Symmetry: D2
C-alpha cells in the first residue's frame, strides 16, 4: 500500500538525518545498556511514554495492552515485570492510565465488542466494586474517574504478585508507581504514596483511593 | 525519589511548552480518531515506534511484550489484535523486532533467569527449528538472525489466529507485515510480501523465510 | 519404579475384565458420540465427577484447575467451554466446588506458596469482597464457606464470558450450574436457580449468594 | 431439568450405598492424604484416569485441557503443576493422550471451530513439524500417531518448564512420564524412559520419538 511506502519513507528520512546529526544516539543505543524504568501503559498510547517523560535514549522498558492491566494471571505482563526486575534490574515500575480510554468506557457501558469483552470483565469487576461512587458523577466523567481507580487497582495487583513479593523479600531495590494523565494538557498525576516494600502496599492502595475516591466527586486531572 | 521527580519536571517542562507552542496538539488528541496501524513490538523498545515511523499523530495502536511475539494462546496480545481490527478497524498489522534483542539471545543461550524462561521457550522452539541454518554462521550473528526468523514466525502466527482469519473471511480490509531493524541505523527492512488475505499467508511465510534464510547466511540489517 | 509398574498392572487387570464383561462399554466409547455435560471441577478431584453423577460412559467432558476457576482471561478454561458448547454442543455446564480445598484455604490465610499464589489472588479477590461475612464466620469453617461463594462467583463469570453470551444470543440450547459438596457425604448441593439465557443470569447470581451469605452463618454441606 | 434431576438422584443413591456400606471411604478422604501423581489428561476423558490406573483412593491430582496440552505459557496448567510439585509434593507427573481425540484430528482437519483453533494451533505446529512421517501413514491413522507424537511433545514441555527445572535443581525426586492408550481396550502404553532429573530429559524425548516415529510407520495401541 502507499501508506506502507510512506512509513518507510519517513524511516529512511529519519535514519539519514539522525545518523548525520546525532550519530552518538545510535552508537550508545547499540550498547547493551539496561533501561531504568518499566512503564505499564495502555495500547492506546495516546501520548507516547518517551514524550510524557523526556526519556529519549531507550531508558523505558515498555509493556502495553488494553486499559493497562496487571491481571493476576496474565503471563505476558507478568513475564515483562520479572524480566524487567530480576534480569534488567529496573528499580522502578510505572502503571500509567489515561483519560479517554476505549477499554475503560467499554467496561462500564458493556457494549458487544467481541473477544475483547472477556479482558474488560476484569475492569468491569472494578466498575462493579466502585459503582455507588461512580453513579454519583456526571456520566461524562465516570469513565475518566474509573481510569484513575483502574490505575490504583493495578498497582495493587502488581504489588501483590509473586514477582514483586519475591523481589521485595530478597531485599531488592524495587518500587511501584501509579500515574494518570488527561487529554487536555497531558500532565501526569501521581496517585498514592511511595511503595518500596511489602509493608507499604496496603497503605499506598488506601491513599491512592483516598486521593481518587474524593468526597467531592472531582476528577484529578480535569 | 529524585529520578522519579525528574520525570514530573520533564513532564511539566514538556506539557506547558506544547501548550505555549502548539496547543492544537491536545485539541487534536480530543477528536480521538482511530489509529490506522497496530504495532506489536518489543518491551526493549530501543527506538520507539513513533520515531521509526514518523507517526506522531495517533496513527499507532501499540502492543509490546518481551521479544515481540504473537503466542497462539496469549489473550493479552490476541485481545489487542482483536480490538484494533474488529473495533478500531485498523487496516494494517506490523510485527516489529530488532537486532540486539536480549530475550532472543537468552532463548539461544538458555541461561536460567526465573519466570521469563517459560515465555522464551516459545522462541527457543524457533531456535531449535532453524538451528542447522543458524549454527552455520558466526555465533555473534545468530541472535540477530533469530530476531529476523522470529519476526517471520510471529507474523505467520498472527495470520493464523482466528482473529485475522475471521477478519479476512468476512472481507474486511486488513493486512499484516514483518518489519526488522538494526540498532546502528534504525532503518526498517520488510520481511516477505503483501498479505491482505488468507490466500497470501503461506506465500508471505516462505518468501520472508527465503530472504531471511538466504544462501549466503547474511544478516539483513548490518 | 514400583508404584509406576503398579499402575500398568492395575490397568492391565482392569482392561481385560471389563473387556471380557462389557465389550459394549468400549465399542460405544469408540463411537466418540457427543458428551452431554462439561464439568469444571477442582484439580483435587476429592470424589470423581463420574461417581458424584454416576455417569461412567463418556457423558462428561471435563476441565480441572486449582479451586475450580472460570477466570475471564483464562484461555485454557474458555477454550474448553467454547469447544464443548460450539463443537460438542453440550447442554449443561456445571461448576462444582468442594469443602476442604487447599487452594481456597490459601486464598484466605495467604501463605507464600510459589507460582500458584498468582492463581489464587483471583480467589483472594472474592475473599476480600466478602471479608466482613467471613470474619464474623467461625475461623475453622472460613475456607469451606468461601469455597461456596467461589462457585457462585465463577458461575457468574461463566455466563458473562463471550462464549455463554453468544450462544445464549444466537439461541443455542445450553445452560449453566453451581454445584458444591462436602467430603463427609459427597451429597451435591445446588447453588442457584435455572439459567438458560442471558435474561436470568442476574437472578441466579443474586439467589446463590443470599443462600450462601445466609444470616445463620452456616455451611451448606456439613 | 429431567437429566439434572437424575444426577442428584444418582448422587444420593451413591452416597447412600457408600456410607451404609463402606464408611471407610469418607473417613479416609476427610483426612489430609496428599496425592502422589499428577495426571495431565484430555478434556475428552474417554476412560477416567481413576479406572485406567486403579487409583480410586485420592492418589491422583488431575489437570485436563483440550488434546491434553503442556503449553509453555499456559498459567492454568502451570499453576496446577507448580502447586502439585511444590505444595502437595507429588513424585510422578503423567501426561496421557489418547487415540480418537477430537482436538487432535481438528488440528489436521483445520475446520472453523471458533476460539479453539488458537489453542489448537499449538497441536498443528506438531502436525506441520512431523507431517512428512505422518503422510507416509494411512489417511486414517495419522491422527492417532499425532496423538502419540503430542504426548512426546507435551512431556518435553513439562520437563522444560521452570517448575520441573527448579524442582529437579533443589534435590526433589519427582519424575515425569508419557502415556497413551487406544479405545479398543483402555490399555496404557509408555512413551520413552524414566525422567527423574534434568540430564535425562533429552534422551526420553529422543526415545519416545524413536519408539513413536518408528521406520515401519506403525501405531502403538492398535
Ligand atoms: Zn486506554
Ligand atoms: Zn527485544
Ligand atoms: Zn480443591
Ligand atoms: Zn482428547
Amino acid at each position: 500500500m502507499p501508506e506502507i511506502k510512506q512509513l518507510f519513507e519517513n524511516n529512511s528520512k529519519w535514519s539519514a538525518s539522525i545518523k548525520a546529526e546525532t550519530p552518538e544516539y545510535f552508537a550508545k543505543l547499540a550498547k547493551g545498556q539496561n533501561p531504568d524504568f518499566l512503564w505499564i501503559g495502555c495500547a492506546d498510547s495516546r501520548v507516547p511514554a518517551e514524550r510524557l517523560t523526556g526519556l529519549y535514549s531507550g531508558e523505558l522498558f515498555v509493556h502495553r495492552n488494553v486499559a493497562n492491566q496487571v491481571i493476576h494471571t496474565d503471563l505476558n505482563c507478568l513475564s515483562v515485570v520479572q524480566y524487567a526486575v530480576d534480569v534488567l534490574q529496573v528499580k522502578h515500575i510505572i502503571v500509567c492510565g489515561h483519560y479517554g480510554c476505549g477499554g475503560v468506557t467499554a467496561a462500564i457501558d458493556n457494549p458487544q465488542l467481541g473477544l475483547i469483552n472477556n479482558w474488560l470483565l476484569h475492569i468491569r469487576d472494578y466498575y462493579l466494586k466502585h459503582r455507588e461512587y461512580l453513579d454519583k458523577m456526571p456520566a461524562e466523567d465516570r469513565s475518566d474517574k474509573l481510569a484513575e481507580i483502574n490505575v490504583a487497582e493495578q498497582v495493587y495487583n502488581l504489588a501483590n504478585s509473586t514477582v514483586l513479593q519475591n523481589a521485595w523479600e530478597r531485599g531488592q531495590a524495587v518500587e511501584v508507581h501509579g500515574f494518570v494523565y488527561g487529554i487536555e494538557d497531558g500532565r501526569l498525576e501521581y496517585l498514592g504514596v511511595r511503595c518500596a516494600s511489602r509493608s507499604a502496599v496496603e497503605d499506598n492502595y488506601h491513599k491512592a483511593l483516598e486521593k481518587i475516591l474524593n468526597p467531592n466527586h472531582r476528577l484529578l486531572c480535569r
